[PDB]
Each structure stands twice: as structure tokens, then as C-alpha cells.
Amino acid sequence: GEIQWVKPNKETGRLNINGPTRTKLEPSVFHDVFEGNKEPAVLHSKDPRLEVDFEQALFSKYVGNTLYEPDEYIKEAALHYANQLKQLDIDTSQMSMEEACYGTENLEAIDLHTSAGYPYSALGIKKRDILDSTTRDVSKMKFYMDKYGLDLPYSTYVKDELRSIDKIKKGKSRLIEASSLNDSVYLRMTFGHLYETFHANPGTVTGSAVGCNPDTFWSKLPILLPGSLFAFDYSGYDASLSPVWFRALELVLREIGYSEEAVSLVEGINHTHHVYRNKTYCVLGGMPSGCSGTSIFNSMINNIIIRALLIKTFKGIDLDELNMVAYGDDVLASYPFPIDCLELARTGKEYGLTMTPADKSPCFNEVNWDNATFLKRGFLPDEQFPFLIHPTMPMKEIHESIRWTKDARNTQDHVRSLCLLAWHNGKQEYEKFVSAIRSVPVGKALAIPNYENLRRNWLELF
RNA sequence: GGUCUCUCUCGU
RNA sequence: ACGAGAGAGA
Ligand SMILES: [Zn+2]
């Protein structure tokens, strides 16, 4: 991805989009009980903590584009994935507006507790003023679709969250691109059925882990990804995508039977316009973080990417012997013979992709089930039933979460949630957690889940 | 102050 | 089953 131009909102006619500049995050009653190295992200140009110009680090993620036009490797890769998806029998027909707005069995309704985007967010119009879960009223929507149209600009905000200290000094906060409700609606009407399919089939056919539950999914993966694991991280995946990958995606949608009218929506995300404060800017390439389809489209593209990298880097790759699962840029993949990711990354560069070793090390060492992680969790065989696999969220990350809070009103729910993540690390580790929580007055007032009950309830999932 | 997923809680 | 909240992940 690359910024093409920046223009004053005066020159473009766009309304100013201003977001909050102070964090909702405050130290919690456990801040000093547990160790951590994360603080609230920088939200403001003159955060005392800054060591670089803020807006320059913010947008530094747009590293540029290399390829615009799929070569033969990318074409073949897009095709292998497309034929694999055909067995899913995706409904390529347009989903009704009612379903797209208000939900189906396999697609959650448009979030109503969340902004309605450009231009409503400036006009003081919220989603609730247009949509109604009880009515399933589609009439006011179909009016605003024809008042403001489609292809409205993304409203850019800085994401309020914890970031490592390195990331706070270096102004490396994350942006989110608020979608216009109009595009969300239209993207959902066009691809809603493909969302449904993907949500109901996490696994190695979709190649996607969207819709998976780690408590039960982790036991399938060593069976879904047989052979030798390989994995790696991307730096700045979304923003690093060159337009070629959106061309590639158009190939996949076309092949599985999408109409040329529907395939044409992809350029709509490859080429996008954003409002940040008082300026308008145009981005070519890069997935816009906050549009409808972000997870699934990123996951689909990864499926294309891993394939193309394999057959351009190595001789005699059989793509039918590749098994992989993606969740956006997160990947776990397997092949009958070990894959050398040092070489994939070299190829990755030629495609404008920045790939680094999985273990966060600077060498591409071996990846195995003992040290693989996916969605931040590891894989730990149960000591009693080894075919069942614990997803192990590191206590380090759990300690990070518990030290802060956006509203201490909800300390109970927060701590319980963390305990449902933490027990998988084992009885000894969990009780060390719990007793540390008890070591403090608010702690002795919380209801904490019993280890053996957590384990008992986990075993009955099977 | 986005898109989604999963899980928990609280109500009728 | 439906409403409201939260946490985590991408
Ligand atoms: Zn443009």
C-alpha cells in the first residue's frame, strides 16, 4: 500500500473527522500486583512519551507497492485456491438487505453499538437512528443508500489499546478505518453468503480459522496440518499489500462464480480514500482495516500468498500437499517436507511482503507443535488425554491485560474472562494466578472459576 | 473511537 | 429464544 496524495478537506469537500485524544485506560487494582511492559498507545501529537513525529510513524506502515499485475505464480496460486473452494458450494447470489443488515444463523447483525461512519458520524446520526433489530426495518436504510451512495471515505481513528514500550516511544499506534454503513451494507449484500460459508467452515478447505473456537479447534489442527509445520510473521501485513493481491483476489471470486458486477467491488477496497482530522488522503493497495470482509478477505489473500511463494521459491512443489489455516495475516501451514522460510521471505520481499521468524527471533528456526503459536496461543497436549490439545495463552499476555481497565465497574467479568484463558497453562500456573489476584482487597471480592470445573467443562466439549 | 470471530456475564 | 454488558484474538 502507498499513499497517493494528501489534500485539505477544504479542497475535497469532506467533513472533518476528529476522534478522542485521551485514553480510557487507567491502571487497575492489579497494576502493581503483576509485572508488565505495556502502556496505553499514543493518541496525541504531543504525548510526552513520544520520541519521533507522531503522524509520520502512524502512516509509515504504507511501505509502497511493488507488483500491480499478477505474474504466472500468483495466477496459478489464485487458481489452486479457487478450485479448492468450489467444494464448499458458496452461494454467489446477492443476499437480501434485511439479512445483510440484521443477520442470519451464520452472520452476526451489523453492530449497532458502533459508529455509522462517514458522513453520519459528523451529522450526529447513529446506526440506531436507521436500523432496528426488532422492526427489521430496511426502508430507512434503502433511503440513505440513495442519499449518500456507495464508496464513501473511510474515517481514520487511532486505536485505544495497550502497546509495548518500544511501540509507544516510536509512535507506532494502530489506525482503524471506520467504514461507512453504506459500504458495510453493500459489501454484506454482495458477499454475505461467502461470509456465512467461511464462518461455518473454519479449517483447511476455506483455509481460514475465522469462526473457530480455540478450545475445540486446537485439537483438530495437528490432524488438519499433518507433516512439517512452517510459519512466520508479517510486519504490517494489511498496509503492505500491493494491488497485485487484489487482482489475485478478483481471480478467485471470478472463478468460483461471482458476477463481474460483484468482482468489481474489490477495486473499491484496493483503491480507497480516507479522512484523518482535517485532511483527505488516497491509498492504493493495502487492505483497509475496518471494512466489511476484512478478516475473510485478508485470510483469502494469505491463502493466495502462501501458494505463490511456495511455487516461486521451490522446484517441484505439490500444492495439493499443502495444508494451511489463516486468520488474516496469522498463519499455520504444513507440507510433507520441511519448508525453509528464510527463502520464502526473500521471495516475499519481491512481492513487497516483510516476513520475519515465528519465534520473534532473528533466525528462521524450526517450527514444531511444541513452539508454534496461532492467535497468540500455543499447543499443549493434555497430560491425561494427549489427543486433546490445550490452547495456551501465555501468562505474560494475561498479566498485561489485567493491569489496566477502561471501566473498573466490570472488574469481575474481566478477571473471569482472563481465568478462562489462563487455566490451560496448568493447575500450578493457574493457582499462582488466582492467589496473586487474592493478594489484594478487590481480589477477595471477585468470583473466580474453580480449576477442576473449568477442566471438567472443557472435557465435556468433546 | 471500524470490521469480524470466539468465549464469558447479566437480564426477560 | 431475545435483549444488555465485557474480555480476548485477527
Ligand atoms: Zn484515490
From TrEMBL:
Which amino acids does the record list as binding Mg(2+) 1? Answer: 233-234, 329
- Residues that coordinate or bind Zn(2+): 271, 273, 282
Annotated positions binding CTP: 174, 236-238, 289, 298, 360
Localization, per the record, is: Host cytoplasmic vesicle membrane; Host nucleus; Virion
Q: Which residues bind Mg(2+) 2?
A: 233, 329-330
How does it associate, per the subunit comment? Answer: Interacts with capsid protein VP0 and capsid protein VP1 to form heterotrimeric protomers. Five protomers subsequently associate to form pentamers which serve as building blocks for the capsid. Interacts with capsid protein VP4 in the mature capsid. Interacts with protein 2C; this interaction may be important for virion morphogenesis.
Name the family the entry cites: Belongs to the picornaviruses polyprotein family.
Q: Provide the function of this protein.
A: Protein 2B: Plays an essential role in the virus replication cycle by acting as a viroporin. Creates a pore in the host reticulum endoplasmic and as a consequence releases Ca2+ in the cytoplasm of infected cell. In turn, high levels of cytoplasmic calcium may trigger membrane trafficking and transport of viral ER-associated proteins to viroplasms, sites of viral genome replication. Viral protein genome-linked: acts as a primer for viral RNA replication and remains covalently bound to viral genomic RNA. VPg is uridylylated prior to priming replication into VPg-pUpU. The oriI viral genomic sequence may act as a template for this. The VPg-pUpU is then used as primer on the genomic RNA poly(A) by the RNA-dependent RNA polymerase to replicate the viral genome.
The name this protein carries in UniProt is Genome polyprotein
Q: Which organism is it from?
A: Human enterovirus 71
Q: Which residues of the full protein are shown?
A: 1732 to 2193 of 2193
